[PDB]
Amino acid sequence: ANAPGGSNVVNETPAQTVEVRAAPDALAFAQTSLSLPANTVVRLDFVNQNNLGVQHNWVLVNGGDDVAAAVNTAAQNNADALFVPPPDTPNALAWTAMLNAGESGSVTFRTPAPGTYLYICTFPGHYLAGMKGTLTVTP
Ligand SMILES: [Cl-]
Ligand SMILES: [Cu+2]
Numbered sequence: 001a002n003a004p005g006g007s008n009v010v011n012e013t014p015a016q017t018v019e020v021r022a023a024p025d026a027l028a029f030a031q032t033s034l035s036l037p038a039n040t041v042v043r044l045d046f047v048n049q050n051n052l053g054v055q056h057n058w059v060l061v062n063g064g065d066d067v068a069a070a071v072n073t074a075a076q077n078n079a080d081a082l083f084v085p086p087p088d089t090p091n092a093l094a095w096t097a098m099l100n101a102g103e104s105g106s107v108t109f110r111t112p113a114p115g116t117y118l119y120i121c122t123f124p125g126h127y128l129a130g131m132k133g134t135l136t137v138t139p
Contacts, residue, residue: 001081006094014043062091075122
C-alpha cells in the first residue's frame, strides 16, 4: 500500500526529470523551490539519504498551506501505508512512496496548469515541522 500515486500520475515518457533530496540533518527538503513547465510529463526523483534514520516522501498538492493540511491530515490517518496520501485523496497531485533513510523513489506525473503549488512530506509531524517547498508551474 506504500506506493506512489496522485491524480496527475501518468505512464508516459518524461519530457523532463528533476531530483529532490532530503536535508541530511533536518526534517526538510534540501531544495525548497522547484520550477517546471505546465502540462508537461515529468519524473521527480526523491533521494532520501539522511543521518537521522528517518522516513520521508514528496507530495505535490493542488494548492497551498490550507490544501496541504487536508492532504497531510488524510495522510496522518493512513499508517497502514506508511503515511502516504491514500489513493484518490482530494487535491493530491502526485506523490512518491514513503522512503526509509537510504532509499530513493520516483513519481511520474503531468504538471498541472501554471500556478503555485506546495510540495510537502506527509510523514507524521514533518510538514508541521516545516518540511515543504514551493513548485512554480510556468506556461
Ligand atoms: Cl520524525
Ligand atoms: Cu519527511
